[PDB]
Design a protein around this nucleic acid. Sequence first.
RNA 1: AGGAGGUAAAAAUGUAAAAAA
RNA 2: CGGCCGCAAGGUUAAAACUCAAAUGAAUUGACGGGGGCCCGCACAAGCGGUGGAGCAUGUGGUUUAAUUCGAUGCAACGCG
RNA 3: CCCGCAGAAGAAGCACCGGCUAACUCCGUGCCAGCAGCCGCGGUAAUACGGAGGGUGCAAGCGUUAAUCGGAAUUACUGGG
RNA 4: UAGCUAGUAGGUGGGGUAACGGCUCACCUAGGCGACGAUCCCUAGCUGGUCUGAGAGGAUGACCAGCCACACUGGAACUGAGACACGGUCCAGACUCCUACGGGAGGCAGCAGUGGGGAAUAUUGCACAAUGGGCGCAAGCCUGAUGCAGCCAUGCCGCGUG
Lengths: 66, 123
Amino acid sequence: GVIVIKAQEYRSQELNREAALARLVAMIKELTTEKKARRPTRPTRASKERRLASKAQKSSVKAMRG
Amino acid sequence: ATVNQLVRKPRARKVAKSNVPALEACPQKRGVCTRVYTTTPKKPNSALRKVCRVRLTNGFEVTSYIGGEGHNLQEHSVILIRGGRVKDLPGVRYHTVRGALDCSGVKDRKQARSKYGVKRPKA
RNA sequence: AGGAGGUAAAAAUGUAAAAAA
RNA sequence: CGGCCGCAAGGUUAAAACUCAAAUGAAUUGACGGGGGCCCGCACAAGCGGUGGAGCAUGUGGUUUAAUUCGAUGCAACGCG
RNA sequence: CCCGCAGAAGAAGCACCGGCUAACUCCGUGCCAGCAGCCGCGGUAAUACGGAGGGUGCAAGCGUUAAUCGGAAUUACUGGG
RNA sequence: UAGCUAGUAGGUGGGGUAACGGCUCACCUAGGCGACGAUCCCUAGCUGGUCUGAGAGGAUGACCAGCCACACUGGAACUGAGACACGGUCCAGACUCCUACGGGAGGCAGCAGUGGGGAAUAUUGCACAAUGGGCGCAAGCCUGAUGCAGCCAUGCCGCGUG
């Protein structure tokens, strides 16, 4: 954790100062705020769609021994 | 048909497949029972069965089925595994015998006491 | 009654707005 | 995948892991067809007069409130009970 | 092995009861939680879930898992396409 | 898995063993094995039988018997009627024990038992009374062979809980 950043391409030292200043700000912010959690979600159409199968299926499965 | 085709190429018997791939002829095996979770079955039904992955003693990460309601496992506490499937979980082949070596038989269970580790109230 | 040519055109899906966790 | 043939495109030979409790054939009855034929109805065409435009009456949704009672809510709810 | 005492005292469970397959009702939960070998059961009356009571099977054994064979004439020589 | 093999295929002669033989050398011939499946790879002790099945087959080979093979790992002999040897010897290695550091010692896949692995599988029991073997003139001596018990509902068979 002894961070070492190299500001090279710019003949002026003070131009390399702000080049290093740009490298400072972006490096830390990308590591600051992470991903958004708290997934997943509860089903929506299960209350209906899944029951749709149960309304048409049960009418057929009543065999009545042969 | 065609005996001469039969005398060159014998009647090959199809290989009978087993359904408990733990190990050949092993009834029950001990399992570490790591990382327990709870998910949902498929299309016809809907529930939240307590199921877990099991790191076996022969390095097999098999997926099992935690039975009953009152569990006692989490990341450790080695238990026992028996075969069988429940068909609702798309991909399970193993069961769990409640009243295991490190999992107690559930209380407030009066009937169906052969399994589920139910001790008969002697009093 | 056989026959011979002849006359015809673009347009999807079924939580279908009702959710977020 | 390996072998072989191939300029190459590939071909030939030929598995398993895993997975569902099915997949499938022919025929039958309906239903449907931007398939065909026959036939009917204000279906259209031929016109008449309206709605939708304005006001008002009245019912519903929504919204709001302490309550706006419940129910009916494609055709077949909405001057409905 | 034989003889004596012998208070019934010291001795009954487990599975299953939707069909497959002998065997039923009520309460509690409301596709949530669970059951299941196969199809499947459960959306506030569940004979299939949990429990209670009643029923049946087997018995000092009882069910589950595993392995083989049978059923599988679904490797067919007997005996298939 | 398509070619496999070079004392390898056979010949001759000597060597060699209880016994014929490339079992082994010298020299000659150039063969022999191969789709009726050789070499090569995986797996496995084999059989009388066991389980099931109408039968034919299918699976299997725990328990009893016959045979083969192994003894911590590899190799090699010797004594002898016979081993190329479980509880003998020589050598190397791996792993333990003893140590005066010089140098030695050891082998439970024998009966029990300990740890361990595993789903799981028993006492550190008693005795040679019977049977079998070994040795001995016999008497006898030894035997965890064998004979029984301990433990287990593990299966079978049987009575009981009136």
